[PDB]
Write a protein that binds this ligand. Structure first.
Ligand code: JEE
Ligand code: JEE
Lengths: 215, 202
């Protein structure tokens, strides 16, 4: 019904698409509020450091636990669901989105470099729900794009917020003939049992060809 | 070296973004009557509107060549994975067609598949409102590659924090023992979160 979302990142500008797809009606009606915070507001040094060399060697830097611990303490309560995009996470699916759609406070912690010191989430887990998730089997530069996906998948399940087993088959609209390609005639037959069956066969077929693992 | 064109009725979403340029094009600049919609009701009936192939056809005609790789995000596409990103990292020209509503008339990709290579892909098993978020993900996964197991936990300073210690092996400086500990963490994490990567059931 109602939901607050805090996003924490060192590139707040990458979250612009969210401000751009949120309807004013939902914000006015207080269905949703989305804040973005610059992690660097919680650094301790004049150089505004967020990253440091990894214990045990290895390429790339790791984000500092001290800075992240500062930010999460301020933003989180014991009622928060802390969401941490990560290339080593549990799969984010539609089931996940559905379950999170009923939460009242999401915090999304977007890391960069090789990620965030593990102690941050371990510590968080001793007093709030914490979920390490990945949005798909590919590698990104950080968690900001993942957050865009997660926020969208979830918010569109919250009634009136974004204004909206087998693979879906093909869709068709006007004109009935275009570049020598006619809309499949069954779709114009006015026989709605035949149409439903024809769509089901397309669906089964496409699913076999594209996602045989759903079977 | 690579060029990416994204075509969308929501160009303001793509807002933020040398050997590579990325152009965002407004599909509506191609409409035939400014007083008409890009979407219409679906043949056969159903919920939601479908995007007409007419406007899409004019846009892609202009923007594509026969060598163009045309990418269409769809919730019914082939899985987009790291293998896909690697394959696309060598292309010279990608055009990403972002749909909205219930999506694009199927004849667009079917007609395009007669003159160029078309790829219907999905970035995940979850539902979006249109192809634009997917295009961002796809662009990010592909560009970072232009010239097995899940990773375990990483740590940096301080060595103790809120009374949590860094795993002492990592302070040992024994490269072989550290490698071993990390493989162990990674296998453990993989079995727990993604058992399918090792051929088990989910
Ligand atoms: N959700 C989600 C994601 C993410 C994601 C999410 C969050 C962060 C924070 C930093 N990064 C970058 C990053 C990339 C790769 C690696 C590991 N490799 C690097 C080199 O050495 C070892 C192997 C680590 C860190 C992130 C990536 N990617 N793909 C998804 N589906
Ligand atoms: N990549 C990727 C994606 C997309 C994606 C990509 C492109 C477009 C263009 C429009 N949409 C919205 C859309 C949502 C749902 C449905 C199914 N419907 C069936 C009948 O009832 C309503 C629902 C169809 C269209 C898109 C979604 N979603 N998830 C991914 N991994």
């Amino acid at each position: 019904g109602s939901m607050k979302i805090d996003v924490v990142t060192i590139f707040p500008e990458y979250l612009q698409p969210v401000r751009q797809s949120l309807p004013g009606k939902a914000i006015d009606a207080g269905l949703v509020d989305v804040a973005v915070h610059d992690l660097r507001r919680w650094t301790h040094d004049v150089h505004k450091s967020v990253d440091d060399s990894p214990y045990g060697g290895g390429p790339g830097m790791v984000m500092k636990p001290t800075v992240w611990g500062d930010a999460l303490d301020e933003i989180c309560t014991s009622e928060t669901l802390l969401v941490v995009p990560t290339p080593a996470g549990y799969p984010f699916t539609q089931e996940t989105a559905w379950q999170w759609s009923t939460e009242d406070h999401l915090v999304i912690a977007c890391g960069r470099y090789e990620g965030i010191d593990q102690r941050v989430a371990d510590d968080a887990a001793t007093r709030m729900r914490v979920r390490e998730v990945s949005i798909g089997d590919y590698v990104l530069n950080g968690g900001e794009a993942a957050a865009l996906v997660i926020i969208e998948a979830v918010l569109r399940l919250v009634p009136g917020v974004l204004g909206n087993s087998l693979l879906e088959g093909p869709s068709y609209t006007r004109p009935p003939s275009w570049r020598g390609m006619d809309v499949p005639p069954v779709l114009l037959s006015g026989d709605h049992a035949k149409i439903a069956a024809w769509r089901a066969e397309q669906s089964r077929q496409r699913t076999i060809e594209r996602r045989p693992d759903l079977l």
